[PDB]
Amino acid sequence: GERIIAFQGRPGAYSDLACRQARPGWTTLPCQTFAQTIAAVHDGRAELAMLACENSLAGRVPDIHALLPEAGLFIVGEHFQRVHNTTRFYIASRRPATLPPPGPGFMTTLLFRVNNQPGALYKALGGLATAGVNMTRLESYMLEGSFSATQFLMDVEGHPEAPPLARALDELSFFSEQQEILGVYPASPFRRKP
Amino acid sequence: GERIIAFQGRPGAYSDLACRQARPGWTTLPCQTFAQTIAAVHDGRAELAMLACENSLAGRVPDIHALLPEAGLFIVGEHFQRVHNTTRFYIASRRPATLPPPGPGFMTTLLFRVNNQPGALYKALGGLATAGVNMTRLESYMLEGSFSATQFLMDVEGHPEAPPLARALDELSFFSEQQEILGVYPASPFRRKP
Ligand SMILES: N[C@@H](Cc1ccccc1)C(=O)O
Numbered sequence: 001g002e003r004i005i006a007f008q009g010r011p012g013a014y015s016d017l018a019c020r021q022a023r024p025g026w027t028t029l030p031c032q033t034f035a036q037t038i039a040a041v042h043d044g045r046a047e048l049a050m051l052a053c054e055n056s057l058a059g060r061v062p063d064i065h066a067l068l069p070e071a072g073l074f075i076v077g078e079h080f081q082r083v084h085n086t087t088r089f090y091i092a093s094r095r096p097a098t099l100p101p102p103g104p105g106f107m108t109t110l111l112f113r114v115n116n117q118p119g120a121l122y123k124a125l126g127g128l129a130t131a132g133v134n135m136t137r138l139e140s141y142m143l144e145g146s147f148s149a150t151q152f153l154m155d156v157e158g159h160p161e162a163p164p165l166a167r168a169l170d171e172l173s174f175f176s177e178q179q180e181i182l183g184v185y186p187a188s189p190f191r192r193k194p
Numbered sequence: 195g196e197r198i199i200a201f202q203g204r205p206g207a208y209s210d211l212a213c214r215q216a217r218p219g220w221t222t223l224p225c226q227t228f229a230q231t232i233a234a235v236h237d238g239r240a241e242l243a244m245l246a247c248e249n250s251l252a253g254r255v256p257d258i259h260a261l262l263p264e265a266g267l268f269i270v271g272e273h274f275q276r277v278h279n280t281t282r283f284y285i286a287s288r289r290p291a292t293l294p295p296p297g298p299g300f301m302t303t304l305l306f307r308v309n310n311q312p313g314a315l316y317k318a319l320g321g322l323a324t325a326g327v328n329m330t331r332l333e334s335y336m337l338e339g340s341f342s343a344t345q346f347l348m349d350v351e352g353h354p355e356a357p358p359l360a361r362a363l364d365e366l367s368f369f370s371e372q373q374e375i376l377g378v379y380p381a382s383p384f385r386r387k388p
């Protein structure tokens with residue numbers, strides 16, 4: 001799949017344009033569904049997938065919390081497209097052997113679980129607060145067939161192998177289970193545009 | 195609109211099935227879009243709308259954070275449907291004159307904003323933890339054209355006029371902006387033994 005990026009939709013669509021902006025040069029592979037987009041990467045028909053993840057006003061985005069780790073994928077980038085509604089996307093590859101070399105400008109997406117008791121999330125976030133680490137996304141998910149715990153996806157500033165994030169995530173681990181890095185990637189300059 | 199419930203999708207869809215489960219004997223009103231679904235309730239073509247909100251495995255749901263309050267709607271119920279995957283839905287009406295009467299067995303859905311600074315969410319959740327209040331959903335959203343604050347949706351056990359939630363919500367108002375009760379409704383028996 002070298003230099004192919006899959007997206008959900010048709011040629012010329014906004015998602016196609018997003019691919020062409022985010023990954024110049026690359027050949028885009030239109031797919032009808034989210035599952036097909038992830039399959040193309042899993043199966044080697046494409047190197048990357050472009051997945052819508054947030055909208056500022058309106059939209060339906062795929063829920064990736066289960067499917068993306070099941071497919072063995074990993075987030076290597078983000079993209080913002082302002083159409084105003086702003087659509088944010090994740091860019092995902094097959095899982096790399098190593099994380100990017102640490103330095104400035106990174107963000108991290110992770111998954112973790114906490115139990116369904118008051119203050120459970122709060123205890124897991126305490127290290128981040130004390131370390132002065134800024135989060136930028138947090139979303140809860142039901143567990144199938146259970147209400148005794150909740151899964152979370154979190155986007156957070158920094159790189160997991162560097163301060164200040166590393167020590168803060170050590171504390172999150174103390175008060176959660178099933179901690180998994182779903183991506184490490186450069187934060188878009190869109191976030192700092194005047 | 196009396197005894198009519200609108201949903202997004204084609205007839206026969208899982209949302210249609212959810213309507214038949216949740217409101218037996220009601221007439222269902224298929225709508226192509228999310229905007230059309232909420233408009234039907236706003237405009238009086240339907241008394242309720244069935245809106246998908248979460249999936250345990252996978253799915254696409256409408257993002258309600260902006261359009262639902264704009265349409266003057268209020269969440270009066272929840273529903274769960276098992277299809278390997280569980281889909282949860284909100285059931286929304288035109289905003290009532292008064293909240294439901296305080297009593298046992300309620301949950302509350304709210305919106306609020308916090309600043310994009312470390313520990314801002316953590317400070318807002320401290321009161322709920324101190325009060326022994328259990329949350330069951332939390333989801334962040336982007337504000338259009340600003341990265342200085344983040345919008346949240348929260349589902350929490352209790353009724354806003356009854357302890358322990360009442361005092362906790364009062365505290366939350368000193369740690370957030372634009373705090374809004376979006377719904378107060380019975381917790382489904384699906385969370386216990388249905
Ligand atoms: N950035 C703020 C608010 C926030 C929390 C979590 C997700 C998104 C925003 C914080 O880290 O507390």
Ligand SMILES: N[C@@H](Cc1ccccc1)C(=O)O
Nearest residue numbers: 119120121150329330331332
């Ligand atoms: N119920 C736990 C975990 C949780 C937090 C937020 C949303 C969903 C679950 C708490 O209140 O801390």
